[PDB]
Design a protein around this ligand. Sequence first.
Ligand code: TRH
Length: 385
Amino acid sequence: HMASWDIFCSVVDNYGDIGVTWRLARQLAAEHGQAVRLWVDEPQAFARICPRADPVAHVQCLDGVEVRAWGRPWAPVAAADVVIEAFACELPEAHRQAMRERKRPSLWLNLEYLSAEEWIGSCHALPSLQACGLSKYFFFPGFREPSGGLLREAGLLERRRRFQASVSAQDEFLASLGVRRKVGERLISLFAYENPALPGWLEQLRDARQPSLLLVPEGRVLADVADWLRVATLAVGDVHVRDALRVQVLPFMAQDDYDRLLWCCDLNAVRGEDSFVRAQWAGRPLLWHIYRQEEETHLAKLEAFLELYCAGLPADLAENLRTFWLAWNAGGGLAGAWEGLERQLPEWRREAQRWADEQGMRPDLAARLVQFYADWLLEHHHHHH
Ligand SMILES: Cc1cn([C@H]2C[C@H](O)[C@@H](COP(=O)(O)OP(=O)(O)O[C@H]3O[C@@H](C)[C@H](O)[C@@H](O)[C@H]3O)O2)c(=O)[nH]c1=O
């Protein structure tokens, strides 16, 4: 059996929305043998998370996914069995006509942003009748049931465990990036936005008794790192030493290589949606920088995740983790919040592995999506399940 899938992605900003839809598109084609067309309105954003891509090509097949440019004006084509509107990006007019014209009209899904709030359970899989007659279904990724789950490839944790149990595989990957760990040096990856709390944290890493290696992929936070280092230029391959802190700049690497980087580090500073979850699959301590929103509505998503993630932690670790995460997202941290958290990183690592294993036994999002279409198809013909 093979169904066809349309996935529409409007790169509003950054690389998370194309990062998530690309990850889903690959999984649908590789693990489920589905026919997948991914529509992106900005090919240059997709080309940086998938270096094999050609930005000027109007159509190309990568990892079994037909990646097509979302054109203006929109070239009319036939609609697939399932049309995934990612993050309410609005489908083309003529494509909704093509969805409605089919003998079996397309299943219309709206892929929502991931949230840990409890209320998304009451809205997951909710149908909404549109004016044209078709219904749209809201799909909420989640950390608890009911929800749409989390993106996770098949055998992901099995590969991660073998990678982290092999000193040679970790050193071999870091050597490809030009990274050489020192004995006793803690490894921290930095992926965030502009953050006024960064200099306060880099000062504590500098003055610490134990040394740290700060690996910074090229991106937004690099100007802040360069400002703290009192340097004008910060290029890929540069290394600067500030007492106990080694800062090394990494390239913006392929998505799967970013996973291996997350797997090497003892603490991963991540952000947004995809890298926030990928750091959890790494089974390592992490730091989440969520971008500020209207008023302060990003505070709700942060506290919702903190309540769930800290539920299994010891009181001391949970309290220090909370205060640090809030300060890291407050645009102005706390001068001593790192000392209390650094001393508990070995125990935090153990709890992060338990968190990954327990989340890893929930069915993945791509499987629930494929199962949603199966139950929806059988129901459409009033058949049993
Ligand atoms: C650092 C790095 C990241 N990546 C990938 C990881 C991610 O899939 C992707 C980045 O996506 P995210 O983790 O979600 O962070 P982001 O900041 O890039 O995107 C986010 O911006 C917010 C404003 C939105 O609210 C979110 O919905 C989301 O789109 O880039 C690489 O491929 N190589 C790299 O070196």
